């Protein structure tokens, strides 16, 4: 792999298993980006380092219903919209 991984693609199919797997990839992609941001702060720690929020897993529904899975997917996508642009800028700044 070169560079940051790409955001997981939405499934064509809205089956419980397509959406459950999509939810798992999105959670995993967030933890990749957050880890990358935390590790890169540690190495280059000038006060300028941009601020980010860590994902609050208490916003995730713990039941396994196609409705609560769809709601989790929305919450993870909203979080990615916050941190992806920051992760991509920190990657470029420090791969310079």
Residue 8: inside a domain: no
CA distance linking residue 31 with residue 20, whole number of Å: 17
End-to-end CA distance of the chain: 18
When divided into structural domains, the chain yields a total of 1
- Give every CB contact of residue 20 below 8 A, 6+ residues apart in sequence: 64, 69
- Overall resolution, Å: 1.9
Residue 84: inside a domain: yes
Range(s) of the domain holding residue 61: 16-41+56-94
Residue 9: inside a domain: no
- Give every CB contact of residue 61 below 8 A, 6+ residues apart in sequence: 68, 71, 72
Residue 46: inside a domain: no
Structure determination technique employed: X-ray
Residue 87: inside a domain: yes
Task: Identify whether the C-beta of residue 26 lies closer than 8 Å to the C-beta of residue 76.
Answer: yes
């Amino acid at each position: 792999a070169m560079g940051l991984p790409e955001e997981p693609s939405s499934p064509q199919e809205s089956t419980l298993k397509a959406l459950s797997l999509y939810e798992a990839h999105l959670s995993s992609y967030i933890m990749y980006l957050q880890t990358f941001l935390v590790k890169t702060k540690q190495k280059v720690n000038n006060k300028n380092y941009p601020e980010f929020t860590l994902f609050d897993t208490s916003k995730l529904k713990k039941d396994q219903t196609l409705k609560s899975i769809k709601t989790n997917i929305a919450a993870l996508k909203n979080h990615i919209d916050k941190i992806k642009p920051i992760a991509m800028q920190i990657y470029k700044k420090y791969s310079k």
